[PDB]
């Protein structure tokens, strides 16, 4: 009766769209306020960057990618405590009552 | 709808982003959701899936 | 915290225009930018869309291939290039901001009316 | 598609509370659960009342209060004030292709 809560595992996630900063080489690191909270899925890269797509100097850029995380369904754990087991016993005896 | 008895050192190993029961933040994400490399200025996700 | 509105007025239809969206009291580089609009009668209709670097551009098929949204990050200012005007252009367009996964702050807002 | 239906005109007297609602009819919307409401009194800019359905921005009033069940959000508005008669817009992430949605619009009439 009433186990304990221990943990809930995540197997269901539906995601929003990522969003992206990014900067040119020696521009510095890119930044999101999605990436200080704690419910986004974030991520530092660098990306090769250069001439053809908007950079002065070619090289590795900063980039971050962030999306928010919502579980769609969870398992959840409960652990069992064995002294807190209860267990049902029926007991009859044959003296020739009808089964209703 | 489904309910089983599991071990804990194997329910603790799951590659599955997990809560601490309460309103709580949920931890490693990624074992859901990564990122895959960057071309230019793009990078989209890769949904490791239900 | 807030985003000044310019551009707006009075133009004919197949004419060209230029809204402007000014920010102050934090860093613009960082955040998601839009341009939202009403018209008379109408919901508010989110039209452009663009990311922090400027690199991610959407649009509403409405105003896909007429109109152009740009931001200059040394000038924190965000632009709406609006060529191929039309009379349902007629709106009432915001500039705003886009932090997590909502649309945050606003501006006052700006009055285009296309007339014949 | 995504098209959140709201009532043009609602009214209440000072010291009421008020319930605005704002039923969604699109594809699939009950997916993301961030509906944010707006506050716009007229000539001035839209501000941020509620988001992520309860959640309330730093400094807003705690009598602005926002519930969902279903299709449908609600805001609620108790202590009902002059100050309230303004223009109150609904709006939701419908979906990953189109993005935010918003209501038509709710004009609050406070019965002074």
């Known amino acids: 009766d009433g186990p304990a809560e221990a943990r809930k595992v995540c197997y269901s996630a539906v995601l929003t769209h990522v969003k992206i900063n990014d900067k040119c080489p020696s521009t510095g690191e890119a930044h999101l306020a999605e990436e200080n909270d704690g419910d986004n899925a974030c991520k530092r890269t660098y990306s090769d960057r250069g001439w053809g797509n908007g950079c002065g100097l070619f090289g590795k850029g900063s980039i971050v990618a962030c999306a928010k995380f919502t579980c769609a369904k969870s398992m959840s754990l409960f652990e069992v405590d064995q002294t807190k087991i209860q267990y049902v016993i029926r007991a009859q005896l044959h003296v020739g009552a009808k089964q209703e | 709808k489904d309910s089983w008895i599991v071990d804990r050192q194997w329910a603790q190993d799951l590659t599955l982003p997990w809560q601490s029961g309460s309103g709580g933040i949920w931890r490693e994400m990624h074992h859901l959701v990564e990122f895959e490399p960057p071309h230019a200025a793009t990078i989209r996700v890769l949904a490791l899936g239900n | 915290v807030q985003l000044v509105e310019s551009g707006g007025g009075l133009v004919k239809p197949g004419g060209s225009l230029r809204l402007s969206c000014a920010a102050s009291?934090?860093?613009?580089?960082?955040?998601?930018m839009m341009w939202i609009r009403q018209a008379p009668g109408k919901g508010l209709e989110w039209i452009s869309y663009i990311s922090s670097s400027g690199s991610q551009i959407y649009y509403t098929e409405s105003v896909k291939g007429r109109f152009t949204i740009s931001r200059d990050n040394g000038k924190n200012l965000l632009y709406l290039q609006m060529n191929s005007l039309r009379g349902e252009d007629t709106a009432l367009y915001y500039c705003?901001?886009?932090?997590?996964?909502?649309?945050?702050?606003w501006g006052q807002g700006t009055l285009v009316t296309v007339s014949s | 598609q995504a098209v959140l239906t709201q009532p043009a005109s609602v009214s209440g007297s000072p010291g009421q509370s008020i319930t605005i609602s704002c039923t969604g009819t699109?594809?699939?919307?009950?997916?993301?659960?961030?509906v944010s409401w707006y506050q716009r009194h007229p000539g001035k800019a839209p501000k941020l009342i509620l988001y992520?359905?309860?959640e309330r921005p730093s400094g807003v009033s705690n009598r602005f209060s926002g519930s969902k069940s279903g299709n449908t959000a609600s805001l609620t508005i108790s202590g009902l004030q002059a100050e309230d008669e303004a223009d109150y817009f609904c709006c939701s992430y419908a979906d990953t292709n189109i993005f935010w949605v918003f209501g038509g619009g709710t004009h609050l009439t406070v019965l002074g």
């Open positions: 009291g934090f860093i613009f580089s960082d955040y998601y």
């Open positions: 699109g594809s699939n919307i009950e997916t993301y659960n961030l």
């Open positions: 992520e359905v309860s």
């Open positions: 705003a901001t886009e932090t997590g996964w909502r649309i945050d702050t």
